[PDB]
Amino acid sequence: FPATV
Amino acid sequence: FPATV
Amino acid sequence: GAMGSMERASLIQKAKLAEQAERYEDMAAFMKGAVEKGEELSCEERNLLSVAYKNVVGGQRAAWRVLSSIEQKSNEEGSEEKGPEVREYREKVETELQGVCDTVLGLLDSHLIKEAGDAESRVFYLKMKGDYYRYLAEVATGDDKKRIIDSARSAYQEAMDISKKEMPPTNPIRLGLALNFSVFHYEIANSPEEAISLAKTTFDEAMADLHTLSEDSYKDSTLIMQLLRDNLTLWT
Amino acid sequence: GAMGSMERASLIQKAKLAEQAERYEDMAAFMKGAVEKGEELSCEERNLLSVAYKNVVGGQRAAWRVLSSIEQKSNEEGSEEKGPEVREYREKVETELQGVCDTVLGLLDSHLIKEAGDAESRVFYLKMKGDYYRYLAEVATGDDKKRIIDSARSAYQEAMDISKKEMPPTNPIRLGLALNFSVFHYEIANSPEEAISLAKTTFDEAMADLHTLSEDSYKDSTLIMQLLRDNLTLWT
Ligand SMILES: *CC(=O)NCC1CCN(C(=O)C2(Oc3ccc(Cl)cc3)CCCC2)CC1
Ligand SMILES: *CC(=O)NCC1CCN(C(=O)C2(Oc3ccc(Cl)cc3)CCCC2)CC1
Ligand SMILES: [Mg+2]
Ligand SMILES: [Mg+2]
Ligand SMILES: [Mg+2]
Ligand SMILES: [Mg+2]
Ligand SMILES: [Mg+2]
Ligand SMILES: [Mg+2]
């Protein structure tokens, strides 16, 4: 997981 | 919450 | 039975997968299917059943407590009227929780308990019966609250009687039963002295038997003993 | 519509309650009902919709990854045959995930996007469209993977074009869009250089505009800027 919003 | 199992 | 066409072994395999994936609703449905095949459950299978439903109902209970608190706040003086929505949604969650409890109680009554002859299996199922009546009691407010409480008490008491006759004081099922019955006394039956007595006597009788145990059994028993101690610390 | 008989305002109230109770499936269903009333959504309501479905699909994606990993392990050399159950259960979760994505895409297509005229609303919905095609892409393996990827890219690109024309470089919707499109490039499109370029340029253009912001707007924008930085650190 890289960050997403 | 007291503990239960 | 949605699960009627699936092999018993496949249901158990998938319950284990669901646990790994933290899909507890799926896990519970798989285990319900497995129980409905009609064969007795092994120890491992009994654990899967209990884990699945404990997690499902646990989430429901937590949600119910959030909503009940909001509802209670809405009924205080100076609180602005917000209409029926909080009560409606608390009722929705409550009804779903009651449904899960009824499902588990149904499995125990048809026919897990009656076919359980070994102490370890019978105590395990009777403890579950007490637990799911206790969850029903937590949300009960009507004509039947007293009867629900008595149903929980009766199941726990039968389990206690068997466990004392048939299992050593360090047996983890016996310890967990006592832990939960003690919580029943404190939280449901308005009997904190009974709760404290039970927890203390259980802890002390287990302590005296630890010397008989392997390292692995010692680990298991001391874990639950610490939970008894934690409750005692909370209550005293 | 199960929610057809409930007032729009009651659905929104209950979505908020469901959020407080961490009942995200309920929250999503309430918000679906609210969208289906046919009126445009406010900013607060758009957030409720996004939060609800992000949490539902997020859980599904996590479960899918657990199961896919177990499946992949089962297909390695020396792995004992365990029958079709792992594939079946991964497929079950996958199908449910695809269903949720299709539901969200359906709401956006009927008729959220077409009625959204303000930049803030249109960019928000197009970002969602990109996101839910990206989730479909994560599990796609067949004839349509390329088309699904292109659908995600197209939605993100339209959102980017509007956001660059109509919103300042610190706008949190613009930042979050760029963050997610950058992830699309890295994880889906096999374009890590594009991902890194986008994240860097977005971060730097935001940095240059922070001086224009209030304390509260600064907090909002810097939070997402840190997420861009975190990804850059992971990727470089
Ligand atoms: C088939 C069987 O013997 N199951 C019981 C066994 C007891 C220990 N286990 C646990 O996960 C922990 O303790 C209990 C105790 C009683 C119950 Cl009903 C459940 C769990 C959980 C906390 C310490 C160990 C495994 C299942
Ligand atoms: C109606 C509206 O303007 N919604 C967007 C707003 C942005 C900031 N919010 C957040 O929760 C955080 O950032 C984003 C950014 C973009 C998106 Cl699509 C969602 C969330 C979450 C991480 C920092 C603040 C509230 C919603
Ligand atoms: Mg068979
Ligand atoms: Mg009721
Ligand atoms: Mg006594
Ligand atoms: Mg109306
Ligand atoms: Mg598939
Ligand atoms: Mg560029």
Short mmCIF file of all heavy atoms in Angstrom, two decimals, chain C residues 145-186:
data_model
loop_
_atom_site.label_atom_id
_atom_site.label_comp_id
_atom_site.label_asym_id
_atom_site.label_seq_id
_atom_site.Cartn_x
_atom_site.Cartn_y
_atom_site.Cartn_z
N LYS C 145 -36.99 -9.75 29.80
CA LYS C 145 -35.63 -9.57 30.31
C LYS C 145 -35.28 -10.54 31.44
O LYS C 145 -34.19 -11.14 31.46
CB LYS C 145 -35.41 -8.14 30.77
CG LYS C 145 -33.96 -7.82 31.13
CD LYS C 145 -33.85 -6.36 31.57
CE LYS C 145 -32.51 -6.05 32.23
NZ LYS C 145 -31.37 -6.31 31.32
N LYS C 146 -36.22 -10.71 32.39
CA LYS C 146 -35.98 -11.60 33.50
C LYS C 146 -35.77 -13.04 33.05
O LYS C 146 -34.87 -13.70 33.53
CB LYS C 146 -37.08 -11.53 34.57
CG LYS C 146 -36.96 -10.29 35.42
CD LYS C 146 -38.14 -10.14 36.37
CE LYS C 146 -38.00 -8.91 37.25
NZ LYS C 146 -39.27 -8.70 38.01
N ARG C 147 -36.60 -13.51 32.12
CA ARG C 147 -36.54 -14.90 31.60
C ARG C 147 -35.24 -15.07 30.81
O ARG C 147 -34.65 -16.14 30.90
CB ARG C 147 -37.79 -15.26 30.78
CG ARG C 147 -38.92 -15.88 31.60
CD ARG C 147 -40.11 -16.35 30.77
NE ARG C 147 -41.07 -15.27 30.60
CZ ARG C 147 -42.07 -14.99 31.44
NH1 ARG C 147 -42.29 -15.73 32.51
NH2 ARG C 147 -42.86 -13.96 31.18
N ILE C 148 -34.81 -14.05 30.06
CA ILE C 148 -33.59 -14.14 29.28
C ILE C 148 -32.40 -14.27 30.24
O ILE C 148 -31.50 -15.11 30.06
CB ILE C 148 -33.42 -12.92 28.36
CG1 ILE C 148 -34.49 -12.94 27.28
CG2 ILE C 148 -32.04 -12.91 27.73
CD1 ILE C 148 -34.59 -11.63 26.52
N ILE C 149 -32.40 -13.45 31.30
CA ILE C 149 -31.35 -13.51 32.29
C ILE C 149 -31.31 -14.89 32.95
O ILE C 149 -30.24 -15.48 33.11
CB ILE C 149 -31.51 -12.38 33.33
CG1 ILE C 149 -31.14 -11.03 32.69
CG2 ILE C 149 -30.68 -12.66 34.56
CD1 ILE C 149 -31.48 -9.82 33.55
N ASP C 150 -32.48 -15.43 33.28
CA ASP C 150 -32.53 -16.74 33.89
C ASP C 150 -32.03 -17.83 32.95
O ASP C 150 -31.42 -18.82 33.41
CB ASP C 150 -33.90 -17.12 34.44
CG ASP C 150 -33.76 -18.17 35.56
OD1 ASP C 150 -33.04 -17.90 36.56
OD2 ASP C 150 -34.32 -19.28 35.43
N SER C 151 -32.30 -17.69 31.64
CA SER C 151 -31.80 -18.65 30.66
C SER C 151 -30.28 -18.65 30.60
O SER C 151 -29.65 -19.70 30.53
CB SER C 151 -32.41 -18.40 29.29
OG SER C 151 -33.76 -18.80 29.28
N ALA C 152 -29.70 -17.45 30.64
CA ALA C 152 -28.25 -17.34 30.67
C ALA C 152 -27.69 -18.01 31.92
O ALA C 152 -26.76 -18.84 31.87
CB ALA C 152 -27.81 -15.89 30.59
N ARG C 153 -28.24 -17.63 33.08
CA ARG C 153 -27.81 -18.17 34.39
C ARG C 153 -27.88 -19.71 34.37
O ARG C 153 -26.94 -20.35 34.79
CB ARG C 153 -28.68 -17.61 35.51
CG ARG C 153 -28.26 -18.08 36.90
CD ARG C 153 -29.43 -18.09 37.87
NE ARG C 153 -30.55 -18.93 37.39
CZ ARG C 153 -30.58 -20.28 37.35
NH1 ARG C 153 -29.55 -21.01 37.76
NH2 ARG C 153 -31.64 -20.90 36.86
N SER C 154 -28.98 -20.27 33.90
CA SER C 154 -29.18 -21.71 33.91
C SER C 154 -28.14 -22.45 33.07
O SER C 154 -27.62 -23.50 33.47
CB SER C 154 -30.61 -22.03 33.43
OG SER C 154 -30.84 -23.41 33.39
N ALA C 155 -27.84 -21.90 31.90
CA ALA C 155 -26.87 -22.50 30.99
C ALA C 155 -25.48 -22.46 31.63
O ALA C 155 -24.75 -23.46 31.67
CB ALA C 155 -26.88 -21.83 29.64
N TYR C 156 -25.11 -21.30 32.14
CA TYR C 156 -23.80 -21.12 32.81
C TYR C 156 -23.71 -22.07 34.01
O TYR C 156 -22.65 -22.67 34.22
CB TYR C 156 -23.58 -19.69 33.28
CG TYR C 156 -23.21 -18.67 32.22
CD1 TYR C 156 -23.82 -17.43 32.19
CD2 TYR C 156 -22.18 -18.90 31.31
CE1 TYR C 156 -23.42 -16.46 31.29
CE2 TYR C 156 -21.76 -17.94 30.41
CZ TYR C 156 -22.40 -16.71 30.39
OH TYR C 156 -22.04 -15.73 29.51
N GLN C 157 -24.79 -22.20 34.78
CA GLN C 157 -24.75 -23.02 35.98
C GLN C 157 -24.56 -24.49 35.62
O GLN C 157 -23.78 -25.19 36.28
CB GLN C 157 -26.01 -22.84 36.82
CG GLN C 157 -25.90 -23.52 38.14
CD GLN C 157 -24.80 -22.93 38.97
OE1 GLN C 157 -24.83 -21.72 39.26
NE2 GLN C 157 -23.81 -23.74 39.35
N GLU C 158 -25.28 -24.98 34.59
CA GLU C 158 -25.09 -26.36 34.17
C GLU C 158 -23.64 -26.61 33.71
O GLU C 158 -23.01 -27.63 34.06
CB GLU C 158 -26.07 -26.78 33.07
CG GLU C 158 -25.99 -28.27 32.80
CD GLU C 158 -26.89 -28.79 31.70
OE1 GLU C 158 -27.84 -28.09 31.27
OE2 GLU C 158 -26.64 -29.96 31.26
N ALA C 159 -23.10 -25.66 32.94
CA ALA C 159 -21.71 -25.73 32.49
C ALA C 159 -20.74 -25.77 33.68
O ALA C 159 -19.80 -26.56 33.67
CB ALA C 159 -21.39 -24.57 31.57
N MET C 160 -20.96 -24.90 34.67
CA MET C 160 -20.13 -24.85 35.88
C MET C 160 -20.16 -26.20 36.60
O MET C 160 -19.12 -26.72 37.01
CB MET C 160 -20.60 -23.74 36.83
CG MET C 160 -20.30 -22.32 36.36
SD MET C 160 -18.56 -21.83 36.34
CE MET C 160 -18.15 -22.29 38.00
N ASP C 161 -21.36 -26.75 36.78
CA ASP C 161 -21.51 -27.99 37.53
C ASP C 161 -20.71 -29.12 36.86
O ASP C 161 -19.97 -29.85 37.52
CB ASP C 161 -22.99 -28.38 37.66
CG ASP C 161 -23.81 -27.42 38.52
OD1 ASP C 161 -23.24 -26.60 39.26
OD2 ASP C 161 -25.07 -27.52 38.45
N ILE C 162 -20.84 -29.24 35.53
CA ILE C 162 -20.09 -30.26 34.80
C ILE C 162 -18.59 -29.99 34.90
O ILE C 162 -17.81 -30.90 35.14
CB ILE C 162 -20.53 -30.33 33.33
CG1 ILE C 162 -22.01 -30.77 33.23
CG2 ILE C 162 -19.65 -31.28 32.54
CD1 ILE C 162 -22.59 -30.52 31.87
N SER C 163 -18.19 -28.73 34.70
CA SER C 163 -16.76 -28.41 34.63
C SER C 163 -16.07 -28.72 35.97
O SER C 163 -14.95 -29.21 35.99
CB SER C 163 -16.49 -26.95 34.20
OG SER C 163 -16.89 -26.01 35.16
N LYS C 164 -16.75 -28.44 37.08
CA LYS C 164 -16.20 -28.72 38.39
C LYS C 164 -16.03 -30.21 38.67
O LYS C 164 -15.09 -30.60 39.35
CB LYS C 164 -17.04 -28.07 39.49
CG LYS C 164 -16.89 -26.56 39.53
CD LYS C 164 -17.65 -25.98 40.71
CE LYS C 164 -17.34 -24.53 40.93
NZ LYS C 164 -17.54 -24.19 42.38
N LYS C 165 -16.95 -31.03 38.15
CA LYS C 165 -16.91 -32.47 38.31
C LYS C 165 -15.88 -33.14 37.42
O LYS C 165 -15.27 -34.12 37.83
CB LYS C 165 -18.27 -33.12 38.05
CG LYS C 165 -19.30 -32.92 39.14
CD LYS C 165 -20.53 -33.78 38.91
CE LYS C 165 -21.68 -33.35 39.82
NZ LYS C 165 -22.76 -34.38 39.88
N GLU C 166 -15.72 -32.62 36.19
CA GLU C 166 -15.04 -33.34 35.11
C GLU C 166 -13.72 -32.79 34.58
O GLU C 166 -13.03 -33.49 33.83
CB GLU C 166 -16.01 -33.51 33.93
CG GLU C 166 -17.31 -34.20 34.29
CD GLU C 166 -17.17 -35.67 34.62
OE1 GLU C 166 -16.10 -36.26 34.34
OE2 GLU C 166 -18.14 -36.23 35.16
N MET C 167 -13.38 -31.54 34.93
CA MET C 167 -12.20 -30.89 34.39
C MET C 167 -11.35 -30.34 35.51
O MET C 167 -11.85 -29.99 36.57
CB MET C 167 -12.57 -29.70 33.53
CG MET C 167 -13.35 -30.02 32.30
SD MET C 167 -14.06 -28.48 31.65
CE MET C 167 -14.54 -29.07 30.08
N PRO C 168 -10.01 -30.29 35.31
CA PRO C 168 -9.15 -29.70 36.32
C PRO C 168 -9.33 -28.19 36.39
O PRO C 168 -9.78 -27.56 35.43
CB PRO C 168 -7.73 -30.05 35.87
CG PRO C 168 -7.87 -30.32 34.39
CD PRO C 168 -9.29 -30.80 34.14
N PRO C 169 -8.95 -27.56 37.52
CA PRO C 169 -9.21 -26.15 37.72
C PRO C 169 -8.44 -25.23 36.77
O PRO C 169 -8.80 -24.08 36.67
CB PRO C 169 -8.82 -25.84 39.17
CG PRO C 169 -8.36 -27.15 39.78
CD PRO C 169 -8.40 -28.21 38.72
N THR C 170 -7.43 -25.78 36.08
CA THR C 170 -6.67 -25.01 35.09
C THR C 170 -7.15 -25.18 33.66
O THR C 170 -6.61 -24.57 32.73
CB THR C 170 -5.19 -25.40 35.11
OG1 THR C 170 -5.10 -26.82 35.10
CG2 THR C 170 -4.51 -24.84 36.36
N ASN C 171 -8.14 -26.05 33.46
CA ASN C 171 -8.62 -26.28 32.10
C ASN C 171 -9.08 -24.96 31.48
O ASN C 171 -9.89 -24.26 32.07
CB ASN C 171 -9.78 -27.28 32.12
CG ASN C 171 -10.33 -27.53 30.75
OD1 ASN C 171 -11.04 -26.69 30.21
ND2 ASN C 171 -10.03 -28.69 30.18
N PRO C 172 -8.58 -24.55 30.29
CA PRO C 172 -8.95 -23.26 29.72
C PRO C 172 -10.45 -23.06 29.45
O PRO C 172 -10.89 -21.94 29.57
CB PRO C 172 -8.13 -23.20 28.42
CG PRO C 172 -6.92 -24.00 28.75
CD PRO C 172 -7.49 -25.15 29.53
N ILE C 173 -11.18 -24.13 29.14
CA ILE C 173 -12.62 -24.00 28.95
C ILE C 173 -13.25 -23.68 30.29
O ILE C 173 -14.09 -22.80 30.40
CB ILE C 173 -13.24 -25.26 28.37
CG1 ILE C 173 -12.63 -25.52 27.01
CG2 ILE C 173 -14.75 -25.09 28.21
CD1 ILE C 173 -13.02 -26.84 26.49
N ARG C 174 -12.86 -24.42 31.33
CA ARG C 174 -13.38 -24.17 32.70
C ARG C 174 -13.04 -22.73 33.12
O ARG C 174 -13.93 -22.06 33.67
CB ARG C 174 -12.81 -25.18 33.69
CG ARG C 174 -13.21 -24.93 35.14
CD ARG C 174 -12.88 -26.10 36.05
NE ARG C 174 -13.07 -25.74 37.44
CZ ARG C 174 -12.82 -26.54 38.49
NH1 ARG C 174 -12.42 -27.79 38.30
NH2 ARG C 174 -12.98 -26.08 39.72
N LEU C 175 -11.81 -22.27 32.88
CA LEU C 175 -11.43 -20.91 33.25
C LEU C 175 -12.24 -19.86 32.49
O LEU C 175 -12.69 -18.85 33.07
CB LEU C 175 -9.94 -20.68 33.01
CG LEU C 175 -9.02 -21.47 33.93
CD1 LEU C 175 -7.57 -21.28 33.49
CD2 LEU C 175 -9.20 -21.11 35.39
N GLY C 176 -12.39 -20.04 31.19
CA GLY C 176 -13.12 -19.09 30.37
C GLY C 176 -14.59 -19.01 30.72
O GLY C 176 -15.19 -17.94 30.71
N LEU C 177 -15.18 -20.17 31.03
CA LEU C 177 -16.54 -20.22 31.53
C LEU C 177 -16.68 -19.39 32.79
O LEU C 177 -17.60 -18.59 32.92
CB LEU C 177 -16.92 -21.67 31.78
CG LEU C 177 -18.18 -21.94 32.57
CD1 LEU C 177 -19.42 -21.33 31.93
CD2 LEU C 177 -18.32 -23.42 32.81
N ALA C 178 -15.79 -19.62 33.75
CA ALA C 178 -15.86 -18.91 35.03
C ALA C 178 -15.69 -17.42 34.82
O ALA C 178 -16.41 -16.62 35.41
CB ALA C 178 -14.82 -19.46 35.98
N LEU C 179 -14.73 -17.04 33.96
CA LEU C 179 -14.53 -15.65 33.60
C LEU C 179 -15.84 -15.01 33.13
O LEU C 179 -16.27 -13.96 33.63
CB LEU C 179 -13.48 -15.53 32.51
CG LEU C 179 -13.16 -14.10 32.01
CD1 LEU C 179 -12.35 -13.33 33.04
CD2 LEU C 179 -12.37 -14.15 30.72
N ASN C 180 -16.48 -15.66 32.17
CA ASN C 180 -17.72 -15.10 31.58
C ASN C 180 -18.91 -15.12 32.53
O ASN C 180 -19.70 -14.19 32.54
CB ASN C 180 -18.05 -15.82 30.29
CG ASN C 180 -17.10 -15.48 29.16
OD1 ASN C 180 -16.00 -15.00 29.37
ND2 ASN C 180 -17.53 -15.76 27.93
N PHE C 181 -19.03 -16.18 33.34
CA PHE C 181 -20.12 -16.24 34.32
C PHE C 181 -19.93 -15.15 35.36
O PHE C 181 -20.91 -14.54 35.80
CB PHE C 181 -20.21 -17.65 34.92
CG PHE C 181 -21.44 -17.97 35.72
CD1 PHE C 181 -22.66 -17.34 35.55
CD2 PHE C 181 -21.38 -19.00 36.63
CE1 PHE C 181 -23.77 -17.72 36.27
CE2 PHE C 181 -22.50 -19.38 37.36
CZ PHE C 181 -23.70 -18.73 37.17
N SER C 182 -18.67 -14.90 35.75
CA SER C 182 -18.35 -13.81 36.66
C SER C 182 -18.80 -12.46 36.06
O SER C 182 -19.42 -11.65 36.74
CB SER C 182 -16.88 -13.82 37.01
OG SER C 182 -16.53 -12.66 37.70
N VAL C 183 -18.52 -12.24 34.78
CA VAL C 183 -18.98 -11.02 34.08
C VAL C 183 -20.52 -10.95 34.05
O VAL C 183 -21.11 -9.88 34.27
CB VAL C 183 -18.35 -10.91 32.67
CG1 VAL C 183 -19.04 -9.88 31.81
CG2 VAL C 183 -16.86 -10.60 32.82
N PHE C 184 -21.17 -12.08 33.79
CA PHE C 184 -22.63 -12.17 33.87
C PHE C 184 -23.09 -11.65 35.24
O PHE C 184 -24.00 -10.80 35.33
CB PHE C 184 -23.09 -13.61 33.64
CG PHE C 184 -24.53 -13.83 34.00
CD1 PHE C 184 -25.56 -13.52 33.11
CD2 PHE C 184 -24.87 -14.32 35.25
CE1 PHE C 184 -26.87 -13.71 33.46
CE2 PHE C 184 -26.20 -14.52 35.61
CZ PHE C 184 -27.20 -14.21 34.70
N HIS C 185 -22.46 -12.12 36.33
CA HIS C 185 -22.88 -11.70 37.65
C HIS C 185 -22.74 -10.20 37.84
O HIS C 185 -23.62 -9.54 38.39
CB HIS C 185 -22.10 -12.45 38.75
CG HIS C 185 -22.49 -13.88 38.92
ND1 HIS C 185 -23.80 -14.30 39.12
CD2 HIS C 185 -21.73 -15.00 38.94
CE1 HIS C 185 -23.82 -15.62 39.24
NE2 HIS C 185 -22.58 -16.07 39.13
N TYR C 186 -21.62 -9.65 37.38
CA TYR C 186 -21.29 -8.22 37.60
C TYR C 186 -22.16 -7.31 36.73
O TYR C 186 -22.74 -6.35 37.25
CB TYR C 186 -19.82 -7.95 37.29
CG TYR C 186 -19.33 -6.63 37.80
CD1 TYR C 186 -18.77 -6.54 39.06
CD2 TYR C 186 -19.50 -5.46 37.08
CE1 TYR C 186 -18.33 -5.32 39.58
CE2 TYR C 186 -19.05 -4.24 37.57
CZ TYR C 186 -18.48 -4.17 38.83
OH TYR C 186 -18.05 -2.97 39.31
#
